[PDB]
Paper text:
The asymmetric unit contained one molecule of CwlD and one monomer of GerS with the CwlD structure being typical of the amidase superfamily. GerS is largely anti-parallel beta sheet with the exception of an N-terminal alpha helix and forms a cupped hand-like shape similar to the LolA family of lipid-associated proteins. While the members of the LolA family are typically monomeric, completion of the beta fold for GerS required two molecules such that the N-terminal alpha helix through the first 2 beta strands comes from one molecule in the crystal and the remainder of the GerS fold comes from a symmetry mate. Thus, the likely biological assembly for the CwlD:GerS complex contains two molecules of GerS and two CwlD and is in agreement with both dynamic light scattering (DLS) data and size exclusion chromatography. The structure of CwlD is the mixed alpha-beta fold expected for the N-acetylmuramoyl-L-alanine amidase superfamily, with 3 conserved glutamate residues and 2 histidines coordinating the Zn2+ ion. His49 (positioned by Glu53), His133, and the carboxylate of Glu65 provide four of the ligands of the near octahedral ion coordination with distances of 2.2 Å. While CwlD does not have an autoinhibitory helix, the N-terminus of a GerS symmetry molecule provides the additional liganding for the Zn2+. As this symmetry molecule is not one from the 2 GerS monomers used to bind CwlD, the interaction is not physiologically relevant. Importantly, the binding orientation for CwlD relative to GerS leaves the CwlD Zn2+-containing active site solvent accessible to substrate rather than at the complex interface. Alpha helix 1 (residues 65–82) and the C-terminal alpha helix (residues 217–235) of CwlD constitute the most significant interface with GerS contacting stands 2 through 6.
Residue numbers in the entry:
A (entry chain B), D (entry chain B): 40 to 236
B (entry chain A), C (entry chain A): 22 to 114, 119 to 195
Write the structure that this text describes.
């Protein structure tokens, strides 16, 4: 009987990264994968806490209106959802994009020096490899610059599902069936991590 | 004095009843095997337990249709046939939300209430999870089939609501 | 006219008896899940079957000690722990020699005889194998526990003899 | 409910192949593996027909005494055991030895152009690889010169468990635990073959 926070990274005025021609953004793909994953977890008897359920950002219009302020308030509000939830786990869904288009693959991250989160990340990365792309040999990497993963007291991981910078992967990431495959991989990773202890 | 000797059929039917109600048995089996040469002897231990098997398969939300979870023993099978994936996981130990036999059977501390044609059964969920606090089952007082089940958070809000439709048993 | 209304405890105990004797059930489950946002709805089918689990583990001939065969469902587990090997095989469908429930329970054409303190039960083994022709079970007429079982070839020679020792059940 | 013929190749006056120094022979190793395999099968509810249970050969002393005649009569008698048994399967256990000591590995054979026997052989060869030696990449080979495999009407295979010509393998083959491992591999191969259909 677990309670899991799923965070579709971005929303509202904040797209994420973009494709070369700026047709495709992180917002919508993150939300799509997160809602697929929500369905997997809830139909298995877990309770899901969402930071966002739709295309919105966690800020109020006070017309101070600094885009950097809007972004910062969004992050603070997501942090409070983590703090006040009494959840067992936090999973953030993003995508990556670099200037070099040759990079591809799903990549998981965990907050530096948190062992439980490293184990969870490894479970999810193994499932992302086995289910989505056996070609992918990426290893889990620590981070210390993701605010939402710092100092949470629960296992916390970020998943960058693929690169919008890569044309083949971008085309895959806009596909509802590929999105479901990724959600399946993440869900299985969570389930293995939870079955050990 | 003592009863009369049982006939063939009385002893046989007693035996049928005894082995039918059996939920566990265990014995030592000394086996002699005789091929075309010397016999050979073996000793085995035979263990029998009657065990529960639950299958939950999702039909409605199209994304999940045909996905399933199967609870067998120490094992759990999680199946996504859309990509022909089967994952086996260990069972640590209600097995799922909607599982009512063996928690509403094996009575403990429990609130029982007879209200508006329903047997209402309430238990606390151990672990003091804010979200999975109390489990309430509504049973039809005439059919004794379960109608509804609610998992309530610590504030009494249903977080999970199971409505049972088309209930049949043997 | 009609009987008096059942009290709380009478309905509850009826429910306990009904779900305890259940060997199969099936239903449609409409589940509402309410997180911190909109509820979401799911439809599952729940299936329950109570299933047999048999384990045979070899103890006596030292070479075989600790080797085992486990019959669960559609599955069979064959284990040699001396090399930490576990092999999973499919179950096609008596599951082993010594298996007596559900063949001597589910009566068919069958010879029943009451001889010298034993219920003797004889069935033919289908397939007309020269070597596995007839299955004979000796049951203690007082305990109704099985004492002995013989697989006889077509000439009446026991090819397998199982002697049951230390039989306990629940 | 299967009945299986196990044939420990050789016996009595007929050793098999021999080690370089002629200390070690096929007779005793074949019998040892065959009796381990007999125990595996019988404890699983199969019935075993043995051609030999001890160190003897299937001939009678008529003092005509041609060693070639003794060998031929041995083979005829084993053939009659196959013919008259109404068994489901025939397994012969031998060993190999060549002038070149570099050769090693368990090798299975099946009678040419018998499909069922080829399937059974493949099952056993796969288990011999997985259980005994993952190094071994030998494939099942047809034969048409093994009398006991010709025209049997039941699935029939010969297993040459290793090479006495190879010093490391010979030392392994005299070890009771290695013999049990081989019996386990053969037993599992049989069981897989029977589980398919
Ligand atoms: Zn992002
Ligand atoms: Zn030979």
């Amino acid at each position: 009987n677990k309670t899991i926070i799923l965070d579709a990274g971005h929303g509202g005025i904040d797209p994420g990264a973009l494709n070369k021609d700026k047709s495709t953004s992180e917002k919508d793909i993150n939300l799509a994968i997160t809602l697929k994953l929500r369905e997997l977890i809830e139909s298995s008897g877990g309770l899901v806490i969402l930071t966002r359920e739709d295309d919105s950002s966690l800020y109020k219009e006070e017309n101070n209106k600094t885009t950097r302020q809007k972004y910062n308030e969004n992050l603070k509000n997501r942090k409070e959802i983590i703090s006040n939830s009494n959840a067992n786990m936090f999973v953030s869904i993003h995508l990556n994009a670099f200037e070099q288009s040759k990079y591809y693959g799903a990549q998981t991250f965990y907050p530096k020096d948190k062992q439980d989160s490293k184990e969870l990340s490894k479970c999810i990365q193994e499932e992302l490899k086995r289910v989505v792309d056996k070609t992918n040999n990426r290893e889990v990497k620590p981070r210390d610059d993701i605010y939402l993963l710092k100092d949470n007291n629960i296992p916390s991981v970020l998943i960058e599902c693929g690169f919008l910078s890569n044309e083949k992967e971008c085309k895959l990431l806009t596909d509802e069936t590929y999105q479901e495959k990724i959600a399946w991989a993440i869900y299985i990773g969570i389930q293995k991590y939870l079955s050990v202890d | 004095m003592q009863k009369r000797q049982s006939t063939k059929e009385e002893v046989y039917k007693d035996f049928q009843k005894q082995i039918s109600d059996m939920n566990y048995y265990s014995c030592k089996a000394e086996v002699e095997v005789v091929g075309n040469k010397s016999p050979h002897n073996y000793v085995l231990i035979h263990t029998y337990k009657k065990t529960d098997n639950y299958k939950l398969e999702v039909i409605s939300p199209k994304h999940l249709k045909g996905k399933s979870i199967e609870y067998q023993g120490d094992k759990i099978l999680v199946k996504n046939p859309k990509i022909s994936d089967v994952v086996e996981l260990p069972n640590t130990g209600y097995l799922f939300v909607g599982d009512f036999i063996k928690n509403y059977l094996q009575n403990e501390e429990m609130k029982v209430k007879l209200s508006k044609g329903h047997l209402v059964l309430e238990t606390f969920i151990p672990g003091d999870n804010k979200y999975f606090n109390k489990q309430v089952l509504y049973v039809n007082a005439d059919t004794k089939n379960p109608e509804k089940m609610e998992v309530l958070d610590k504030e009494g809000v249903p977080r999970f609501t199971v409505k049972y439709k088309d209930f049949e048993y043997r």
